[PDB]
Amino acid sequence: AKYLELEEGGVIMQAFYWDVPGGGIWWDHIRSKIPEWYEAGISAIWLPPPSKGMSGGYSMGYDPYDYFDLGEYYQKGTVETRFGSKEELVRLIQTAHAYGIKVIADVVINHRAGGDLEWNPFVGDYTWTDFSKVASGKYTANYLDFHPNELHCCDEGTFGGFPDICHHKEWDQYWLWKSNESYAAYLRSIGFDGWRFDYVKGYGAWVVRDWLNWWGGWAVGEYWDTNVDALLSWAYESGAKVFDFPLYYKMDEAFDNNNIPALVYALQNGQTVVSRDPFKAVTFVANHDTDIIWNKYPAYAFILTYEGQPVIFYRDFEEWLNKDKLINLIWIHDHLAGGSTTIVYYDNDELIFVRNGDSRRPGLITYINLSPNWVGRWVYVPKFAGACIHEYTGNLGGWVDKRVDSSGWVYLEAPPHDPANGYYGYSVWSYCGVG
Numbered sequence: 001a002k003y004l005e006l007e008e009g010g011v012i013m014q015a016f017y018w019d020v021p022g023g024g025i026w027w028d029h030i031r032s033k034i035p036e037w038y039e040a041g042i043s044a045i046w047l048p049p050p051s052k053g054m055s056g057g058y059s060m061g062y063d064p065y066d067y068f069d070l071g072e073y074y075q076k077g078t079v080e081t082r083f084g085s086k087e088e089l090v091r092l093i094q095t096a097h098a099y100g101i102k103v104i105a106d107v108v109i110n111h112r113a114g115g116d117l118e119w120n121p122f123v124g125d126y127t128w129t130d131f132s133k134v135a136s137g138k139y140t141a142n143y144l145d146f147h148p149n150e151l152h153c154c155d156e157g158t159f160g161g162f163p164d165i166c167h168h169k170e171w172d173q174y175w176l177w178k179s180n181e182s183y184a185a186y187l188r189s190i191g192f193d194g195w196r197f198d199y200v201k202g203y204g205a206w207v208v209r210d211w212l213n214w215w216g217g218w219a220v221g222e223y224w225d226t227n228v229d230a231l232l233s234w235a236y237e238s239g240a241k242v243f244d245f246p247l248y249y250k251m252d253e254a255f256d257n258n259n260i261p262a263l264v265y266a267l268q269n270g271q272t273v274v275s276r277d278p279f280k281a282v283t284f285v286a287n288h289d290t291d292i293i294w295n296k297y298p299a300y301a302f303i304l305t306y307e308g309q310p311v312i313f314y315r316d317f318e319e320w321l322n323k324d325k326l327i328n329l330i331w332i333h334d335h336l337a338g339g340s341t342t343i344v345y346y347d348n349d350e351l352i353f354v355r356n357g358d359s360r361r362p363g364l365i366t367y368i369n370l371s372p373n374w375v376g377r378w379v380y381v382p383k384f385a386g387a388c389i390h391e392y393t394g395n396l397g398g399w400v401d402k403r404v405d406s407s408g409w410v411y412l413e414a415p416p417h418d419p420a421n422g423y424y425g426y427s428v429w430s431y432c433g434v435g
């Protein structure tokens with residue numbers, strides 16, 4: 001990558017959204033963006049589930065049918081998946097690698113879909129559990145591979161009415177990750193570096209732990225819950241990171257309702273994954289399932305200057321927000337945003353905090369303002385005492401430098417929050433001469 005690598009906490013780009021244009025053009029489209037994302041500082045890309053789904057060309061990949069068909073077998077009415085051909089996917093992955101950008105596979109293994117009808121003796125009725133006809137000829141399955149079966153009636157959870165995979169069966173373990181012929185092996189063989197596990201609340205953390213013991217690589221699990229104890233419990237049991245949904249909902253409460261204290265209190269009370277273990281939290285402002293934060297500028301300013309590992313949503317970067325602002329924040333994240341965090345000030349519409357720096361990043365001062373007016377106030381930041389500080393976003397309208405007195409006091413300023421008029425509501429500062 002250009003700056004920090006994925007394993008170093010680099011910025012991740014979720015390279016899709018719900019219902020992206022079909023026709024098998026997505027892999028090629030994302031490939032065309034790789035050079036631009038490289039220059040922007042992106043360290044890795046998270047791609048949608050790559051396998052042929054039940055809905056064929058209409059599938060977003062979350063209804064996997066033939067795990068080993070990445071768009072090269074004719075079935076479910078199409079050869080390519082909604083995203084493209086296997087060849088196009090491999091080309092995308094290898095192109096990302098050419099630019100030093102890692103690739104994350106979206107692993108959907110709680111359930112399967114598109115199976116044929118067969119008599120299920122455990123249910124006493126017909127179920128869509130016959131996967132004997134998958135065109136790849138790999139990982140066929142039947143009622144013995146789903147719940148209920150002879151081992152138990154169910155596991156941690158189900159997803160709608162889709163057949164629920166029983167990972168306790170050796171056949172399923174072998175085909176998913178526990179062998180050199182597995183789905184994990186296949187994904188790794190074509191270049192996937194890391195993993196994003198879908199609906200992990202639906203099965204045991206032990207599944208992800210064994211998968212990682214076999215293949216390693218960066219990993220995150222999608223555990224949809226606001227209970228931090230549950231998310232972290234899963235994170236430690238699985239050995240993977242978790243998406244910080246608690247932070248997401250708190251940022252909505254705070255930035256969308258002029259109520260920053262709600263966020264600060266959640267952080268201070270360990271009610272976010274990031275404020276408890278920033279090495280386990282994958283932060284985000286929006287994703288393909290939920291997008292409730294309207295005031296995205298202060299939200300991105302926050303996750304790109306605060307602790308944790310941030311993910312930028314495709315639509316925000318490529319379609320909806322001022323791309324230059326996100327490019328600037330990525331630079332700030334990788335060059336200045338390091339160390340512990342000290343909250344300097346906060347009220348309904350203002351948030352000022354300091355990143356104390358680490359071995360590679362000197363630290364910074366973030367000043368978020370939700371009000372439609374210019375704001376300024378004296379702040380006590382002894383870390384920068386007697387130093388020359390520079391504003392690195394340009395949001396004040398130009399080149400701005402300030403001299404912090406020997407005591408640590410300096411008059412900090414932030415622009416109005418009025419994106420409709422070109423004002424973004426935040427300023428970021430650090431030592432002069434960094435870059």
Ligand SMILES: C[C@H]1O[C@H](O[C@H]2[C@H](O)[C@@H](O)[C@@H](O[C@H]3[C@H](O)[C@@H](O)[C@@H](O)O[C@@H]3CO)O[C@@H]2CO)[C@H](O)[C@@H](O)[C@@H]1N[C@H]1C=C(CO)[C@@H](O)[C@H](O)[C@H]1O
Nearest residue numbers: 007008009278279307308309337338339340341357358359
């Ligand atoms: C690279 C790292 O950057 C960020 O981590 C910072 C923490 O958020 C801060 O709290 C602070 O942690 C310090 C510890 O509290 C202290 O006990 C001691 O261990 O020193 C730490 C600082 O050196 O500073 C951290 C570094 O700036 C970010 O939040 C975090 O996600 C990043 N971790 C990445 C790096 C590695 C391996 O080297 C992987 O474990 C993670 O998956 C990466 O995301």
Ligand SMILES: C[C@H]1O[C@H](O[C@H]2[C@H](O)[C@@H](O)[C@@H](O[C@H]3[C@H](O)[C@@H](O)[C@@H](O)O[C@@H]3CO)O[C@@H]2CO)[C@H](O)[C@@H](O)[C@@H]1N[C@H]1C=C(CO)[C@@H](O)[C@H](O)[C@H]1O
Nearest residue numbers: 130131132133139140141142143144145150169170171172
């Ligand atoms: C070949 C077969 O392998 C797997 O089936 C094994 C089950 O997973 C095990 O749990 C065990 O099932 C036995 C029960 O433990 C026992 O209580 C009793 O119910 O007998 C069961 C066996 O009849 O052993 C099974 C292997 O003998 C895998 O789960 C399963 O999908 C595999 N079936 C393939 C074979 C056909 C036949 O045309 C197709 O229907 C399927 O698509 C194939 O995948």
Ligand SMILES: [Ca+2]
Nearest residue numbers: 155157164202
């Ligand atoms: Ca399940």
Ligand SMILES: [Mg+2]
Nearest residue numbers: 024025084085
């Ligand atoms: Mg195509």
Ligand SMILES: [Mg+2]
Nearest residue numbers: 256292293294
């Ligand atoms: Mg909202």
Ligand SMILES: [Mg+2]
Nearest residue numbers: 347348349350
């Ligand atoms: Mg105020």
Ligand SMILES: [Zn+2]
Nearest residue numbers: 155166167168
């Ligand atoms: Zn089971």
